[PDB]
Design a protein around this ligand. Structure first.
Ligand SMILES: Cc1nnc(C(C)C)n1[C@@H]1C[C@H]2CC[C@@H](C1)N2CC[C@H](NC(=O)C1CCC(F)(F)CC1)c1ccccc1
Ligand SMILES: CCCCCCCC/C=C\CCCCCCCC(=O)OC[C@H](O)CO
Ligand SMILES: CCCCCCCC/C=C\CCCCCCCC(=O)OC[C@H](O)CO
Ligand SMILES: CCCCCCCC/C=C\CCCCCCCC(=O)OC[C@H](O)CO
Ligand SMILES: CCCCCCCC/C=C\CCCCCCCC(=O)OC[C@H](O)CO
Ligand SMILES: CCCCCCCC/C=C\CCCCCCCC(=O)OC[C@H](O)CO
Ligand SMILES: [Zn+2]
Length: 346
């Protein structure tokens, strides 16, 4: 490419304190989640198995962060095996992380959309069996990347980087780009759209409504058959000529009842987890897509080559930072996690 700017002198001063902070806050955060799930929650649910495995893949990702900090500040002083091992934990940590967020979304889809089936399908052992396969798939998805990585001496300094075979370089840039973009953005986004379409459809058709005038409660499960409303009818699907079976007021005098079912309330946490993941990682996937491909489809200039390379460094740093965010989410969005802390203190 073009004669890029030396940001290595800046990165040596800026990245080590940042990475040290992320590591401390993340290690403390994910260790707390793990001990709270294994000792207070005791892993009695399928959800608890996936939440534990999600914390473990964040910890795997975290263990690498102190090594990248030293490398930034000095050089690669850890040797070749360490370079492949840590690159390995970074890719494995990443892929398994998004795989456990997908499993948590499908786990919720079953409990909410196929409720009676989920009673027999959502078991702890199935959660453990599916966790093992997930880890194996993540290891195999990360394998080409571990093989291309090595430690080498470039003049006087030691490096730890990925080296694609030349006269095949564009093929591997293209292949490794589409692998991260499909598995880290296209796959979770497709899961999200399909699963939350079904979840939202169930949540809405089971929504209870109450009359603000007489206090009558409409339950879609019962309907109002004496007024020609069949059991199983969503309140929003009732024609506007229907009136309250008690006081006789219109549909406009009705208000939504707050969610009572714990399985329906649990949708808020898992949806927040997936949406926060996209805020931290979608910027990287889009910059990665632009830097590899759209470099020909859009900007090929020397100035844009440097701008897109610096943007790749910033967005990957933002993504890395995500390994310390889920514990914050559980503390504020998770009902059980905040209730435990209230008893533990008092
Ligand atoms: C040192 C260093 N110092 N700080 C850092 C981080 C913590 C900020 N790091 C590194 C940067 C690198 C190299 C190893 C690891 C950690 N990172 C892996 C990046 C990886 N993308 C790819 O390999 C792309 C490269 C471009 C392409 F080739 F065209 C297509 C494939 C990825 C990104 C996100 C998830 C999984 C894997
Ligand atoms: C406790 C965790 C503290 C963070 C680890 C120390 C900072 C670090 O990893 O930096 C490497 C440095 O060059 C070598 O002292
Ligand atoms: C887990 C903690 C690992 C920290 C090791 C590290 O990266 O510090 C740099 C090295 O110790 C300095 O030569
Ligand atoms: C509840 C389940 C817990 C989750 C458990 C997840 C297990 C996956 C973790 C690490 C495997 C790392 C695989 C990388 C193997 C290292 C091989 C290597 O890179 O070393 C080559 C070196 O050159 C030779 O001299
Ligand atoms: C459909 C399930 C989607 C899961 C896709 C995950 C499969 C991982 C994969 O693509 O395999 C890597 C292989 O080693 C590359 O040569
Ligand atoms: C609650 C927030 C907790 C942690 C987020 C901390 C993240 C710190 C902000 C991200 C900084 C960043 O990604 O850009 C720096 C880049 O490395 C320039 O070289
Ligand atoms: Zn009424």
């Amino acid at each position: 490419p073009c004669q890029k700017i030396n940001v290595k002198q800046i990165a040596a001063r800026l990245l080590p304190p940042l990475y040290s902070l992320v590591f401390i806050f993340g290690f403390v955060g994910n260790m707390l989640v793990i001990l709270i799930l294994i000792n207070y929650k005791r892993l009695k649910s399928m959800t608890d198995i996936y939440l534990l495995n999600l914390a473990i893949s964040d910890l795997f990702f975290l263990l690498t962060v102190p090594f990248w900090a030293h490398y930034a500040a000095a050089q690669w002083d850890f040797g070749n095996t360490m370079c492949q091992l840590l690159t390995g934990l970074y890719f494995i940590g990443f892929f398994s992380g998004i795989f456990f967020i997908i499993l948590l979304t499908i786990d919720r889809y079953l409990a909410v959309v196929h409720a009676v089936f989920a009673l027999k399908a959502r078991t702890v052992t199935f959660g453990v069996v599916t966790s093992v396969i997930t880890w194996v798939v993540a290891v195999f998805a990360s394998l080409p990347n571990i093989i291309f990585t090595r430690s080498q001496k470039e003049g006087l300094h030691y490096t730890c980087s990925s080296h694609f075979p030349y006269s095949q370089y564009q093929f591997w840039k293209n292949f490794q780009t589409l692998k991260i973009v499909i598995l880290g953005l296209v796959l979770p986004l497709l899961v999200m759209v399909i699963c939350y379409s079904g979840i939202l459809k169930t949540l809405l058709r089971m929504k209870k409504y109450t009359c603000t005038v007489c206090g009558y409660i409409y339950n879609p499960e019962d309907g109002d058959p004496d007024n020609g409303v069949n059991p199983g009818t969503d309140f929003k699907d009732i024609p506007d000529d229907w009136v309250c079976p008690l006081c006789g007021v219109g549909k406009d005098q009705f208000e939504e009842v707050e969610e009572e079912k714990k399985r329906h309330r649990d949708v808020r946490l898992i949806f927040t987890i997936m949406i926060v993941y996209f805020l931290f990682w979608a910027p990287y996937n889009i910059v990665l897509l632009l830097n590899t491909f759209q470099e020909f489809f859009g900007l090929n200039n020397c100035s844009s080559s440097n701008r897109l390379d610096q943007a790749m460094q910033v967005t990957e740093t933002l993504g890395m930072t995500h390994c310390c965010i889920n514990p914050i989410i559980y503390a504020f969005v998770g009902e059980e996690f905040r209730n435990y802390l209230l008893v533990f203190f008092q």
